[PDB]
């Protein structure tokens with residue numbers, strides 16, 4: 001393939017790496033929210049009781 | 050526009066996408082720190098008493 | 099010195115930035131895992147007690 | 148106790164993620180034109 | 182009677198997605214080597 | 217209870233994030249040289 005076509009495929013691969021990172025961050029948000037919700041619905045009411 | 054110009058702009062958008070990811074991670078640190086501080090300042094004292 | 103060699107080096111640097119982000123996400127997993135473990139091994143028993 | 152509320156920061160991250168996705172979409176659209 | 186928190190599924194997915202990201206960079210760098 | 221302390225890993229994340237920022241800086245300056 002040409003040098004141009006190689007740089008092009010190199011940059012799709014990099015974008016796909018960023019997209020996987022984007023997905024991973026999305027799930028980090030989910031994990032942190034799960035922690036927040038667990039604290040507010042399980043820990044906090046327990047201490048309140 | 051040429052193939053070289055197209056590749057240069059493509060990489061510029063990809064860097065901006067990484068820069069947004071970097072911002073996201075910065076805030077993920079803040080969110081987790083807030084959970085740490087809430088546990089230490091609100092939950093542990095309550096549980097110690 | 100050529101435009102193609104410049105693009106090549108730019109992509110190579112973007113990749114390194116993404117690698118740093120990958121490292122940072124790995125550590126975020128550890129940080130969140132640590133909060134989970136702390137809740138499960140310290141707070142949860144304390145409340146059950 | 149008042150609940151922990153990190154919604155402000157989580158919503159901010161969600162917003163920056165959408166931006167990140169738009170830039171990658173734009174990058175790929177340009178690459179498609181090559 | 183308080184269930185422990187368990188986010189291991191999501192954490193293991195983040196890990197797998199992180200490894201997938203490392204693979205895409207690997208491929209990118211390999212193509213760049215072939216220039 | 218002993219307090220939870222994850223400040224080390226969080227500041228380490230902050231360090232790795234600044235490295236990432238510099239890498240984007242370099243990448244952008246090479247593209248300008250085109």
Ligand SMILES: [Ca+2]
Nearest residue numbers: 106107110213
């Ligand atoms: Ca190179």
